């Protein structure tokens, strides 16, 4: 069959901290040579990705001390040294053993970490200059929270929700959140969210 | 040092060929293996396809989806690899990357934005976005293609100001809110750089 | 904006002009009369009047009578008056219908407000500010020496305001540089870098690794700065069995 991975998809890091991210093979990824087969690999934030780590452990040329790789067979861990703000991106664990490689598996979101924030959430109802055109969009603007972990519910159902998930900043290191509610003419004639920044639905409408 | 450097770049409509070309630069591009891995917007990558080296046999493989007609091929006298876009699709309005290695992607080039889309240009339609009683926002939906830039009180404001990405509409068209968080009445512009049309609001609740 | 402003304003010629003229603000302000204003204070010494006609070319002629530099704009038209402003569709907005006002960047300085401000301003409603009120280009010229600008470089084919900006400091003790520009008939490059050469003189910073870049220059051999010595030596102080 296929060797399928796992990581924690959503690891955060600090500044001046040392990190580990890990990846589990359900199979052997180990050769007969005794050479583990994974490929330790970032993506910068809208940029090219790069090849951090291949063979299990090595490093590839340019890339950083920062980066160590090691693990078993089946278990498999980057720890990085020096947590920098390149570092922050999507790493990914590529297996060899097997190459027809469909897609890079769902990436650990690496993200600078702070304190849990406060979800801003902000129900704006369509203007009426949105309706002449038979179109309506009531936007629930999900502000300043972190992690990214928020699903928001469209009530009084759901379903014709877009999705938009932002640039996390520098100074701030939060979340900004759009679920574009696109709407017709008579089903215009309600937004909450489960962020662990809250525990109780906040249920505002339009 | 070694570059990948990409072009074939444009537009097309679902059905139509395209060319993706990439020009290696500082080692001998005989002995590694091409591939093409594609950037879906919203995710990481997928793998397109990739020739094996040229004395290996050059033989090619593409993922099953696209197998046929996607066409990769390379050459050593002009150091230049083609991925022939046969037939493109919703799913090929993607980034595009050269990777120098059929299962050691290395360099990863710089990346190509190729777009699919059946929409045409027009400037965006500016809806506001009246606050409930709090922040001031405004739409740029019903745009494309994707150059953008919405700042707020024109450039004056930049503390608060976060402009949402782009938004993908099923009829083909792009999607973004730009927003503001600040007490108070603010003006928002638009330009919309191929058609330039450039649309001013003034948001009240 | 600018090729719209003269299109529409080609018509008006005919029933005023503007003249430009080094006289001093005082004498010409007070003998002003029959729908005359002055549209620019470019200096203590240096005012550009827009009159209607047959009197603004009496008042070149009075500054002829007076021996000052005399030059009948033949590009005469109508602006920072009434003339213009009835116009308030293709005057006022039509020139300007798209802008990008900018954030503070490298402070730029408007006249019409006398003082800097943030590039919010600019679009259709200066030119109807340009175009109503006066100018007060002097008290810009003064805000630049508060905020520390001397050196003057004239974007023109022919020397007219550096030549005022040289009267800026002709009363004031805050002297300052006014580039010449290319004299009037200069039309070649010999002229751009003898002007470059000049403002380089005066101050200005050229940033000459741009300017040798497509000549494909080679660096050689020069002498060194001539350190001009003095004499410094810091002898013992004792003598011996004093």
Known sequence: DVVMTQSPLSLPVTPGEPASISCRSSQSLLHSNGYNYLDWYLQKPGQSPQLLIYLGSNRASGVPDRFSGSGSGTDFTLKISRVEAEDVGVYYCMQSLQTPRLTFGPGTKVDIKRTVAAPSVFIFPPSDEQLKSGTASVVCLLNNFYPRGAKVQWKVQSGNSQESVTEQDSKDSTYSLSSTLTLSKADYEACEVTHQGLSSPVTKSF | ?205 | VVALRSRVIATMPGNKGMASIAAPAGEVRARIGDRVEIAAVNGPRSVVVAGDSDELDRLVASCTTECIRAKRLAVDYASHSSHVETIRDALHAELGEDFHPLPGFVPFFSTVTGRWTQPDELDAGYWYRNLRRTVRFADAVRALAEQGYRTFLEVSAHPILTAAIEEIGDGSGADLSAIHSLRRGDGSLADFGEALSRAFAAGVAVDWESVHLGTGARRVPLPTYPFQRERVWLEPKPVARR
């Not at chain 2, 919703?90 to 777009?115: H, I, K, M």
């Not at chain 2, 009180?153 to 930049?158: D, I, M, R, V």
């Open chain 2, 1 to 205: 040092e070694v570059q990948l450097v990409q072009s074939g770049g444009g537009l097309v409509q679902p059905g139509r060929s395209l060319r993706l070309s990439c020009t290696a630069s500082g080692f001998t591009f005989g002995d590694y293996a091409m591939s093409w891995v594609r950037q879906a917007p919203g995710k990481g990558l997928e793998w397109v396809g990739f020739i094996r080296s040229k004395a290996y046999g050059g033989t090619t493989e593409y993922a099953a989806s696209v197998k046929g007609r996607f066409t990769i091929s390379r050459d050593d006298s002009k150091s230049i690899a083609y991925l022939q876009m046969n037939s493109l699709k919703t799913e090929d309005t993607a980034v595009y990357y050269c990777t120098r290695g059929g299962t050691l992607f290395d360099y990863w080039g710089q990346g190509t934005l190729v777009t699919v889309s059946s929409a045409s240009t027009k400037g965006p339609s500016v809806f506001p976005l009246a606050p409930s009683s709090a922040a001031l926002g405004c739409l740029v939906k019903d745009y494309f293609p994707e150059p953008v830039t919405v700042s707020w009180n024109s450039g004056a404001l930049t503390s608060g100001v976060h402009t949402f990405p782009a938004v993908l509409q099923s009829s083909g068209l792009y999607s973004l809110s730009s927003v503001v968080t600040v007490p108070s009445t603010y003006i928002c512009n638009v330009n919309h750089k191929p058609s330039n049309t450039k649309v001013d609001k003034k948001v009240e609740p």
